[model samples]
Target: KSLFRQSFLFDSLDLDHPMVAQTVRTEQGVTLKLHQRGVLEVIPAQTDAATKNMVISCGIHGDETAPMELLDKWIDDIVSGFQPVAERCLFIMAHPQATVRHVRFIEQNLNRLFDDKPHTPSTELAIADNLKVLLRQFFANTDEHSRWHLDLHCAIRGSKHYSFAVSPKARHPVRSRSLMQFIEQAHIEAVMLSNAPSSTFSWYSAEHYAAQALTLELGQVARLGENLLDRLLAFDLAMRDLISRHKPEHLPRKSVMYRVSRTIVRLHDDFDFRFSDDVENFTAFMHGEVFGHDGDKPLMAKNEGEAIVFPNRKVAIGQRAALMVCKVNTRYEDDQLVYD
Candidate 1:
C-alpha cells in the first residue's frame, strides 16, 4: 500500500504493470498519480489554475533516508484520508535505484546534475533529465508566486544548527516572506543565501522557473528507520500546515540569515580542509585564518565572523568544496527580506 515500498521493488515501470501509469482517487477527493518509479503527483479534487504549486523532492542523495520516510508518510496520510491536500503537489523520490541499494548515488553525485547539459552519461544523469522534464510539465500552468520547490536532504556531517535551508539566490533577488516565515516556524534557524549559481535541483527551479526554491538540510543522515523523527516535529507540523493551508500562520520571523560570500571551488584532486572531519557546519573562523588548501594555494577566511557550510574535501574537481558565508541582518517587509 506504500508507494515508497512499491518504488523500491521496481527500477522501471512498464505499461502493463498495475502501478505503471496508475491514477487513483482517495476517499477525500484527491487525485494520486504514480507518474514514474518515484514520481507521484497529488492534486486536490478542487483546484483553480492559480492554486499554489509545490514540488517536495527527497532521496536525491538516496542515503539521506529520513526525509524520504517523512515524504512517504506524508503521501500515505494524504492517500489514507488522514491529511488534506489543498494545493497541487508533486512528491519525488528522486533516486529509487540508489535508495534501494542504500547508497549515496548510483554512479556520480546526482545533486550536481539537475537540468544540466552534456554531462558524461550515467544512471543519475538519466534521472536528472527525466525530473527536469517532469518539473517543466508541472510548472507549465504556474504563475508568479505560485511556484515552490523544496528539495529535502540530510547532512552527511553534524552541524551547529541542526536544521537549516540553502536558499538559492535568484536573478530577481526578491525573497519570499511567506517561505521565510514557514522556514522560521519549521525549526530551521539558519539560511545560507546562495551567491553563486550551479546545477543543483533547487537552483534549476529557482533560476529557470522563478520558483521559491530551497534545498533543505533537515538533520544528520540516518538509516530509514533509525531517524529520530521526534526531533523534527516542528518541521513535520509546518509541512502539514503548508499542505493543508498555503497561508502559514502569521508569526514573527526567528531565522538568522547568511549570504554566501565566496565559494571554495575544488580546483584539483588534492583539496583538503585544514580542520578535522569532526568540524561542524557553520563553524566560524577569523578573517586571516587559513581554513583549507587547494593544491599549493591556501584558503583563508575573508570576514571576521566567516563561517563554512557544506565543507567537503573530496568533491570532483571544478565543483564547490565549501561555501564561505557571513551573517546578514535582515527584516521582513512586504513579503521580502530586506537587508539592514
Candidate 2:
C-alpha cells in the first residue's frame, strides 16, 4: 500500500520522539528498523556494515522537498516489499522540524551549524548533536569495505547544469576511481568541488567520519508533489546500483566541473550587486569585467573565466552575496537537463 500519504507517523517524528519504533523482517532476510522519527536502518541479515555502510539523507533544508519526497518513494518501495535491501543503510529525514515549517531553517542554516560548536535550543543544536552521534555510530560500526554519504539537496536558484553534486575535500578519502564512477552512474552532469572546509552535513561526514560524502544537488527547489520522476533520469537506477553494491556498466563523461575560487561577501553597506534575478546559477562574466561594487571598491573578475553562483541580493549582511567560481574543465555539450 502507498503509505497513507499524510501518515500520522511522520506528522511529528524524529529519533527521540515519543512515537513507537517499528521493526520488520523482509522475506529476503533483511531486517528493517525504524529508529526515532526520521531515521531508519536497513540491514541484510547476512551482510555486515563493513561491507558497505551508507547514510542517505534528504530535506536538510526543509524547503528543499523534492529529494525528501523521492526518498519517501524509495522508502515506500522498500517497506512494501518491492525493493530488497542490499547494503547496510541508514536513511535520515534531516531537518524534519524545519520540514514541518516548510522553511530552510527555523533559526540558523543547519547546513552551516555542523561545526561541532555548542548550539542552543532543543529544536536545533540538540538535534544536530543527536544526528552526529547517530552518524558516527553508523560509520564507526562498519567494516573494511566502504562508507558513503549522499545528502540530497535542491538549489534555490536555477542551475546551468540542473543535476550536480558538491564534493567535500576529503580527510581519509575514499578512492578517486570509486567516487567518480558513483557520480557518473548517478547521472550527475556537473560537480562543484569545495576548495576549502565547510560545516555542511556532507562535509562533516566526509571530514570527520572518513566517509565518501557528496552534497548532491538534484535540481531546483520545489514543493512536495511538484518534482517529476521523469526529470531525474538515471538517478533512481543509480541508487539501486549503490544498494546492490554494483558499479556502472557505462560510466558518464563530458561532465562540467567547477572549482570555487572565492566567496563574494556582503562586504559593505554600499555593495551594489550586478547580477539580477534573471541571472541563473553558473552565469558567466568575462575577464576584467567590473560586475559589482561596494561603493569605492569594485568586484571584478580577476581570471580569464569566472562565473557567479547562488547570487542573492536580499541576504543578511556579512553573509555570502554570491560565489565567484571558475570553470576548471568541462566536456558537456549536449541536451539540457531541465527541471520544472
Candidate 3:
C-alpha cells in the first residue's frame, strides 16, 4: 500500500501547525503512531527487475527543509505515476521528530552519530545504526547491477545554488571522470571531493559497499518556497535524463578535482571574529590575504588557493567557519582506499 495516495499538496498546510501524530514502523512491518517517535516513510519502485538499485534519502538533519520537501514531492510524483529509469528506487523520508521542531537534529546531529560503536550508542546513534541495518537489508535483497546512492541536503545560507560532494576515496580513475561528467550534464556548478572517513551516509554507502554514491547539496535550507520547488523538480528530471541517456562506457571525462585536507571550525570564544568583507565558498583567495579576524588577530591564507567548501554564514558559533583550500586538477589516478 502506498503511504500517500493523493497528489502533492502543501499550500493549504499551516507552517506552525504541529504534526497531528507520529508514525512508527517496527522491523517486523507492524505500523503504529506514537506521540514521541519520529516517522520513517519509504517508497519503493513498482518493479521486479534486479539490474539497478538507487537510494534517495533526505532529512538526516532536522533543520534542512528543502530536501525533505523535495522528497515529499518526489514521492508523490512516483506514487502518482512518475516512473524512474532505474530498476529500483528507494526514497526515505527521515526525521519527522526533528522536522516538526525545525531543528538540525533530534537531541544530537544524526550525521555525526554514525561513528559510534555498539557499547556507546546514544539515542541518536542507535537510530543511525538501525537505519543502516534496515538499508543494508533492503539493498542486499536487490539485484545489484548498478547501485547508486544520492543523499539530498540543503545549505544554511548562500546565494549560490546547487553543488555536490563525493567521497574522495571512492573516486577511482575509472569512475571519477564519468562521475564529473554526470554532474556537469546535470548542470551542477561545483563538486567538493573529500578524503574523509566513512562517517556520512553517502560515504558509508559508497566506500563500504563499492557503490557509486554522491550527496547533493541544494540551495538554502530556509525559504525554499516555490523557486526551489521548481529546481527540485528540474533536478529529478535531470537525474532521470542522465540515467536514460548514458551507458556505463560512454560517460565523459574532463572533471576538475580538489582534495579536502581539513575542515576549519570556528570556536565559541571566537564568535566575535567577523570579516570586513564577505568571503563566499568556492571563492578564490591570494596568498596572505586577510580573510577574517579572530579577536583582532588576522587570519590569512597560507598559500594561493580557493575556498572549495565551507559552511555558510548562518552557522552558529562552534560550527564550521568559512574557508576551504583546493588545488585544481584535471588529470586522474587509480586509487581505491579511503585514506590513501
* Best candidate, lDDT: 1
- Residue 176 local lDDT, model 1: 91
TM-score for candidate 2, please give it: 0.87
Q: lDDT tens digits, residues 1-340, model 3? A: 3332232223112345434444544333333232212233332223445445666777676666777665566544433345333345455555555665667776666765554334354556766886687467657755333666777777654524355555434433213444555566555555666645546777767655556678777765774353366665546555655433334332332334555756656665554333422434566567767566666355666558755355445555655665465655544455322212
TM-score ranking, best first: 1, 2, 3
Better of 1 and 2 by lDDT: 1
Clashing residue pairs, backbone N/CA/C < 3 A, model 3: 62-104, 63-103
- Candidate 1's residue-wise lDDT over 180-277, tens digit each? 87798797878988887778899988888888888889889898778898877788878988888755554534877898989877867667778888
The alpha-carbon deviation from the true structure for residue 62 of candidate 2, after best TM-score superposition, in angstroms, is 1.0
The estimated TM-scores of all candidates read: 0.90, 0.87, 0.71
Off by over 4 Å in 3: 1-50, 116-123, 141-145, 159-161, 168-178, 224-227, 242-256, 265-279, 293-298, 312-323, 332-340
For candidate 2, lDDT tens digit of each residue in 1-340? Answer: 2223344226333434444567778766777776767777888668853467889988777778777766776777776657666788888886787887777788777777787666557456656777898887787646424778889988787888888888786555532456666787777887787767777889888888777788888878787668776677577777877876655555566457788888787866877767667777887788768787889678888777688787887766666787777777533223212111
Badly placed stretches (over 4 Å) of model 2 are 1-18, 48-50, 118-122, 143-145, 247-251, 329-340
> Residue 148 lDDT in model 3?
68
